[PDB]
Amino acid sequence: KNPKSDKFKVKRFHHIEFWCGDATNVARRFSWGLGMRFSAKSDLSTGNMVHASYLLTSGDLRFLFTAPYSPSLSAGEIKPTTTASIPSFDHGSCRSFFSSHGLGVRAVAIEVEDAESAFSISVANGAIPSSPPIVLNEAVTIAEVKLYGDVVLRYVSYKAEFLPGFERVEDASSFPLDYGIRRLDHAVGNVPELGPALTYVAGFTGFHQFAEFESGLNSAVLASNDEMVLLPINEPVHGTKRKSQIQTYLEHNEGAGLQHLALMSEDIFRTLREMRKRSSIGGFDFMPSPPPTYYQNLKKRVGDVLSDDQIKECEELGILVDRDDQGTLLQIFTKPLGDRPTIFIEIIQRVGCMMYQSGGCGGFGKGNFSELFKSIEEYEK
Amino acid sequence: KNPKSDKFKVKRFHHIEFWCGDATNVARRFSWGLGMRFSAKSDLSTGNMVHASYLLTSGDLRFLFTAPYSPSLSAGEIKPTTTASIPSFDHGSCRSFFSSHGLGVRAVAIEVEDAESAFSISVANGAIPSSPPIVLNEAVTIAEVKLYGDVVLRYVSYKAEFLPGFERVEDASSFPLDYGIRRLDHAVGNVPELGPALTYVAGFTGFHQFAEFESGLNSAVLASNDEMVLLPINEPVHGTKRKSQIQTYLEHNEGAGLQHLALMSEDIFRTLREMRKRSSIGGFDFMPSPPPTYYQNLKKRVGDVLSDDQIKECEELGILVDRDDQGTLLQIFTKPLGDRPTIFIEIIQRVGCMMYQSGGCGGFGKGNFSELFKSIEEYEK
Ligand SMILES: Cc1c(C(=O)C2=C(O)CCCC2=O)ccc2c1c(=O)n(Cc1ccc(F)cc1)c(=O)n2C
Ligand SMILES: Cc1c(C(=O)C2=C(O)CCCC2=O)ccc2c1c(=O)n(Cc1ccc(F)cc1)c(=O)n2C
Ligand SMILES: [Co+2]
Ligand SMILES: [Co+2]
Helix, strand or coil: CCCCCCCCCCEEEEEEEEECCHHHHHHHHHHHCCCEEEEEECCCCHHCCEEEEEEEEEECEEEEEEEECHHHHHHCCCCCCCCCCCCCCHHHHHHHHHHHHEEEEEEEEEEEHHHHHHHHHHHHHHCHHHHHHHCCCEEEEEEEEEECCEEEEEEEEECCCCCCCECCCCCCHHHCCCCCCEEEEEEECCCCHHHHHHHHHHHHHHEECCCCCCCCCEEEEEEEEEEEEEEEEEECCCCCCCCCCCHHHHHHHCCCEEEEEEEEEEEEHHHHHHHHHHHHHHHCEECCCCCCCHHHCHHHHHHHCCHHHHHHHHHHHHHHHEECCEEEEEEEEEECCCCCCEEEEEEEEEECCCECCCCCCCCCCCCCHHHHHHHHHECCC | CCCCCCCCCCEEEEEEEEECCCCHHHHHHHHHHHCEEEEEEEHHHHCCCCCCEEEEEEECEEEEEECCHHHHHHHCCHHHCCCCCCCCCCCHHHHHHHHCCCCCEEEEEEEECCCHHHHHHHHHHCCEEEEEEEECCCCCCEEEEEEEEEEEEEEECCCCCCCCCEECCCHCCCCCCCCEEEEEEEEEEEECCHHHHHHHCCCHHEEEECCCCCCCCCEEEEEEECCCEEEEEECCCCCCCCHHHHHHHHHHCCCEEEEEEEEEEEHHHHHHHHHHHHHCCCCCCEEECCCCHHHHHHHHHHHCCCCHHHHHHHHCCCCCCEEEEEEEEEEEEEEECCCCHHHHEEEEHHHHHHECCCCCCCCCCCHHHHHHHHHHHHCCC
16 A cells, blocks of 8 residues: 655655765775766865765766865855855764764755755654755755754755766766666665654655564665655664664664665676675675575575576575565675674665566565575574 | 984884774775785774774785774773773874864884883983883883874884784785785875974984975975984975965865875886776876976986886886986875875885895985976976
């Protein structure tokens, strides 16, 4: 059931913004590790005396990395005279965010029909305002409300290239890397208490609970009208034998925040081949692969969707497979992106639910917790 | 003239420590860009609840990247019960350093005969103490004094692998990258006033002025007894037509700090080939190459040291060449390592002064300021 109760017109995920201490080094690491091209910049060379912001793109996926300059460079500015290209940016907020949480996602940005209306309706329905709507060069409107912890939901709307004040990157500085990643599939938060978090966000968005199907978590998924914007949220389950990874997150993150970004690939085999080649030369590491028991067990579960060669290719790359009543999910998880055991990335590809593909086809892989555990026990025997 | 006036026995440069916001991302970027292998770690997985520290090595060059965890992880600790592997580390100091200066060098570490003696003699001769001598596992002693700005000179001495509490890295996580870099040749500071900086450092070390031979700077070089530890210092020259890059440094860095690290290569051609291949895929960019006039002019200056093919190889890679009365210097400079126009790296190789090679053979390339300017003007004509 999808009651289509969005309180304003939402289109798709637009970008994800990381708040960094040094945007250059994080952006260069991410570019090489994920196969994303340098696409736009806003920094000293573009007249921005406030913050350095670098945009990476792969297909429709947009990662923004932002870090503050010394406040002394902009000490004479006021908001009416700012050289910042992102008017919501604040030196103190960014330094405090990074001190508290380390490297992580500050903003989950969605494109909407009218950011000023989305902001007004959201706040009228309980959203905690973070940054009021600001019109940039009479061309783009951006506004921000609190999502969870210190993460904001950012609304962006275009009258008719990223943001005014950003320059396209000189293609000599823009190597055309591409490992197959194409868009953001979902963005997941960790919170201490799931119920109040869901009530808050569904309250101000009108997002509905996405239909789904004892190890760590309780979760639920909020979805836009066409279920293309997907915001799962997790809470820990306390008192178990193996400590909940959600609770570990909350301890090392200093509270609620974004847990993982799931990036859709148009060819998950190629993406994982390319990412794994680079794991030890600057890129990203992956979680330990499941035992061969797990792949022997794949034949009985997905042998009608994947051939034996396709299954052994999953085994080569450590790919997990799960199944809905409608579609099949291929997924794999990186180790944490930075120093703290907090944020990580998921690579996914979905098969089925053809109409275009419907959002959330195959689910989110919750069935893979049990399957992984069983495979580990069976391999031990 | 070298009066050999060191007040304690100094051996060689030992390591350089960067203070970061996220040590993982900076270390991975640097590893790929410079061809340095992951060699040791001290972090949550080794029992360090205070800071994450990753060591990269290439030959004898050692780069350490350190970032603080949330203070909450170590809130119950006191210095006598610390899990930090570097006892001088302080959460507040590190966060304040990074807020003020951005990504940069906190410590220039030299190996000495006896770090406790070096510290005592240094402070008795005017050094401002930063961290007192601490003996680690009855095996290594480390102490720190102020060098300039918020940079410390770190003394390390070994009774008889990096530091106790660091673990060697599992070689599956240690890809054997190597682009030819072998050691730190010199480390350079920028200060507002050269005279007082020189008097201070030479005062407490006994380092002597290194013998040398109107665009930006005044500089001088302090050297150890065998002139293997080389610490140049620059001050700006104000009131010129083109603004001094030393003054730009001081403005964006919020004062004095480390300007550049010069890394000796055993094969500067191979190093630059490998680094330039990676500039746009996560590595480091280089300053704009000199005009062909500069390389046409090389024949008359170094045509007795380099063949025509060796000179055109310099032209392929943008390498600068300068000459002493004793030796020849090949050098090139990266663009700034991070967001701010502050710290950068120099790659160098020296030819001549064979006895082993004597330190500082060929100088530091100050003659290349004039040669670059002349080449630019001649190319314009
Ligand atoms: C994050 C994740 C998901 C996931 O995407 C997801 C959502 O999108 C929304 C609903 C809740 C949720 O969970 C699915 C399966 C995962 C993982 C995952 O993180 N891990 C990692 C892990 C490894 C060993 C260990 F001991 C503990 C955790 C998995 O193993 N599976 C199998
Ligand atoms: C840092 C450097 C050195 C150097 O190593 C050095 C020391 O070790 C100690 C003594 C002082 C000193 O300077 C030598 C030559 C350099 C540079 C350098 O930084 N640049 C970069 C530059 C480019 C364009 C522009 F407009 C301004 C600066 C150069 O061009 N040359 C030619
Ligand atoms: Co997921
Ligand atoms: Co130099």
